[PDB]
Write a protein that binds this ligand. Structure first.
Ligand code: RCK
Length: 265
């Protein structure tokens, strides 16, 4: 077994935070000292070989904007120990009591962090396939991180999916860029569902005819332009995450030097 393997008695599961058919998620303590998130896998749901393959991936990706794997109990029942993201999902963060205080400088810094995590995914030649606010985790001091997208995919959203991926199964880093554009609308609306009022079938129909969401209220046109680059019909014309990270990092000097705070953004 690996240097990642830990004894079962070194973990305390203190608070249950989430529940699905896959298993559960807990806040707990590791070795009596370390605050951790503990994801359990229900026995019998997944092939040990498949878990072994995904575990290898998890132990190879280290990035400050990717939630860090800490340890594993890799025999059934399986436990997965990661750094604890104390605010939960970005979706819940934006919808909850904090959303009303967030302004455009905070939201764009959050987007820059997520781009930085996806930039790393990009240069490691991986694909997320479900980039959206429900799958981003938030910690203290507005830190945002990309979660365990590989394990998520194995365990398993038309409105976040690029058309070539939704129709033809063409999932690439360029379809993650499209999703990142949708996530920009989540940030600027404080977590509203995209394409408000439209059902999935009409979203798909319209987007093929060239429909794109309009500029959200109080969002600068230059940020809506960036969204529209992410939603280019040709995937190869969409920008890289490396470009998205640099544009968002530099935004309030290079792009909107005259930004003034408003009622909501
Ligand atoms: F497996 C792996 C493997 C490698 C990297 C990352 C992971 C997943 N590591 C997590 N996974 C999950 S999934 C949980 N869902 C369900 C409920 O709310 C949305 C998220 N949550 C996590 C973590 C790490 N910290 N947290 C916080 C959860 C939370 C919820 C509510 C309040 C405070 C904190």
């Amino acid at each position: 077994k690996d240097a990642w393997e830990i004894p079962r008695e070194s973990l305390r599961l203190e608070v249950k935070l989430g529940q699905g058919c896959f298993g559960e998620v807990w806040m707990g303590t590791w070795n009596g000292t370390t605050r951790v998130a503990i994801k359990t896998l229900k026995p019998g749901t997944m092939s040990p070989e498949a878990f072994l393959q995904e575990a290898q991936v998890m132990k190879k990706l280290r990035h400050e904007k990717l939630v860090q794997l800490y340890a594993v109990v890799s025999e059934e029942p399986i436990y997965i120990v990661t750094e604890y993201m104390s605010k939960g999902s970005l979706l819940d963060f934006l919808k909850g009591e904090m959303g009303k205080y967030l302004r455009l400088p905070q939201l764009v810094d959050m987007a820059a962090q997520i781009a930085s995590g996806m930039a790393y995914v990009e240069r490691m030649n991986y694909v997320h396939r479900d980039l959206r606010a429900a799958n981003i985790l938030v910690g203290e001091n507005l830190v945002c991180k990309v979660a365990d997208f590989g394990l998520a995919r194995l365990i398993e959203p038309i409105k976040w999916t690029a058309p070539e991926a939704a129709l033809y199964g063409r999932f690439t880093i360029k379809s993650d860029v499209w999703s990142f554009g949708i996530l920009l609308t989540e940030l600027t609306t404080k977590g509203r569902v995209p394409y408000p009022g439209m059902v999935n079938r009409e979203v798909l129909d319209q987007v093929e005819r060239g429909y794109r969401m309009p500029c959200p209220p109080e969002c600068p046109e230059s940020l809506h332009d960036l969204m529209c680059q992410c939603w280019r019909k040709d995937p190869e014309e969409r920008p890289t995450f490396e470009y998205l990270q640099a544009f968002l990092e530099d935004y309030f000097t290079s792009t909107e030097p005259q930004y003034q705070p408003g009622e909501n953004l």
